[PDB]
Design a protein around this ligand. Sequence first.
Ligand SMILES: *[C@@H](C(=O)N[C@@H](Cc1ccc(O)cc1)C(=O)O)[C@@H](O)C(=O)OCC
Lengths: 44, 246
Amino acid sequence: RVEKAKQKSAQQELKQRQRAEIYALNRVMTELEQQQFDEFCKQM
Amino acid sequence: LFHVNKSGFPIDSHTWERMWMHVAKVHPKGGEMVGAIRNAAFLAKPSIPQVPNYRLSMTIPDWLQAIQNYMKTLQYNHTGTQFFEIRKMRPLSGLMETAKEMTRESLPIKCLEAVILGIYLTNGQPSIERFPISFKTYFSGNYFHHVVLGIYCNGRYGSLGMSRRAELMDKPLTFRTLSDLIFDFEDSYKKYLHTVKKVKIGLYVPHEPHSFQPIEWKQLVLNVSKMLRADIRKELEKYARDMRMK
Ligand SMILES: *[C@@H](C(=O)N[C@@H](Cc1ccc(O)cc1)C(=O)O)[C@@H](O)C(=O)OCC
């Protein structure tokens, strides 16, 4: 109903927070791999 | 090396803590990078991509593009922890349950996960034939294994997949022969300064919902280090002809 949509469960909130952390981490690790790739392309 | 989540979901504490311990080592900024994420008061919630749904106004190439776009939006997984365990000799029906879990969790994936997800999302179109294509390559002192999902339909070859490199995954359904597809991958690898060591072609993957046979990954294996391109072509074309005769 109205009330249930206002506030997710602790479990739902944790799952969403972990997914946000996974994507924040994937962004920085993708950038790091892209930098190392970009660097190597110029060093050849 | 990379870790695999062998705890399923919810991810257990050991697997979660190990994920962060690993990236603190790999990333130059170490614990500073990790703390900036783990201790953030607020993190942006990534949009959840909709699972592709076929519509009558799609051609087969359109549908393959929708599927590939979904996998691209999940993103290639550079976290160092593969989130979905794929035992590639498991019965297909069990791998399809894992593909369903990928669509529910909506997390980054790597190449093998993308093959399984690509099978799942094309099971509803029996005119699309799917078969794994594997490469062992050498780059900068180390060896790398990679798999993509080969596609055959109406006299053309293409592929679906995921890779950290843009040219090692999806290929349009415009290759007139299997060899032309394989050599496009080889030329892509060579532009990335990889050397191809082995090519493996699997069997067509059944579409039926509860198939209990494993995927066959290496019906044809080519060790290409001392093979001429003309001889690689002859073997691939003989094998492709056998695929199409059933
Ligand atoms: C298979 C996979 O993701 N393969 C990698 C292969 C690769 C390509 C290019 C470079 O430079 C390095 C490695 C990919 O396509 O990104 C996947 O399931 C896996 O985990 O393999 C580990 C290499």
